Paper text:
Human UHRF1 (huUHRF1; ubiquitin-like containing PHD and RING finger domains 1), also called ICBP90, is a multi-domain nuclear protein associated with cellular proliferation and epigenetic regulation. huUHRF1 contains a plant homeodomain or PHD finger (huUHRF1-PHD) that was shown to be necessary in the opening of dense chromocenter structures, possibly through its chromatin-binding ability. We proved that huUHRF1-PHD is a histone H3 reader that shows preference for unmethylated versus trimethylated H3K4. In this work we show that the PHD finger of human UHRF1 represents a new mode of histone H3 recognition that requires the appendage of an additional zinc finger, relies mainly on the recognition of H3R2, and shows preference for unmethylated H3K4, although it can accommodate H3K4me3 without compromising the complex formation.
Two forms of the protein were produced, huUHRF1-PHD314–367, which contains the canonical PHD finger sequence, and huUHRF1-PHD296–367, a larger version that includes the additional putative zinc finger. Indeed, we were unable to determine the structure of the complex between H3 peptide and huUHRF1-PHD314–367, the shorter form of the protein that lacks the additional zinc finger. Crystals of huUHRF1-PHD314–367 obtained in different crystallization conditions and grown in the presence of a large molar excess of H3 peptides belong to space group P6522 and diffracted X-rays up to 1.43 Å resolution. However, the crystal structures invariably showed one protein molecule in the asymmetric unit with no peptide bound. The structure of huUHRF1-PHD314–367 in the free state is very similar to the structure of huUHRF1-PHD296–367 in complex with the histone H3 peptide except for a significant shift of residues 353–358 in loop L2, which anchor the N-terminal amino group of H3A1 in the huUHRF1-PHD296–367 -H3 structure, and a major conformational change of the N-terminal region (residues 314–316). In the absence of the additional zinc finger, the N-terminal tail (residues 311–316) of huUHRF1-PHD314–367 blocks the binding of the histone peptide in two different ways. First, the Cα of C316 is displaced by 3.3 Å towards the histone H3 binding site and its side chain is flipped towards the position of the H3K4 side chain in the huUHRF1-PHD296–367-H3 structure. This conformation of C316 suggests that when this residue is not engaged in the additional zinc finger, it could interfere with histone binding. Second, due to crystal packing, the N-terminus of a symmetrically related molecule occupies the histone binding site. All together, the flexibility of the C316 residue and the crystal packing artifact could explain the difficulty to obtain crystals of huUHRF1-PHD314–367 with the histone H3 peptide bound.
Numbering used by the authors: 311 to 365
The structure:
Amino acid sequence: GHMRVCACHLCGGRQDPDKQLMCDECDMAFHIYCLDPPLSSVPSEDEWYCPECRN
Ligand SMILES: [Zn+2]
Ligand SMILES: [Zn+2]
């Protein structure tokens, strides 16, 4: 298989993969700290929808 780049949609960085969430609709990655407002911790739950897709 191939590796996806998964850069943060907001900042363009790949740092702190442990602090990134992937949107289960649009498949884009986000740092929790790049969201406006930021999420404080990576939720233990494996489902997540970005601000665009949740609405
Ligand atoms: Zn970011
Ligand atoms: Zn999304």
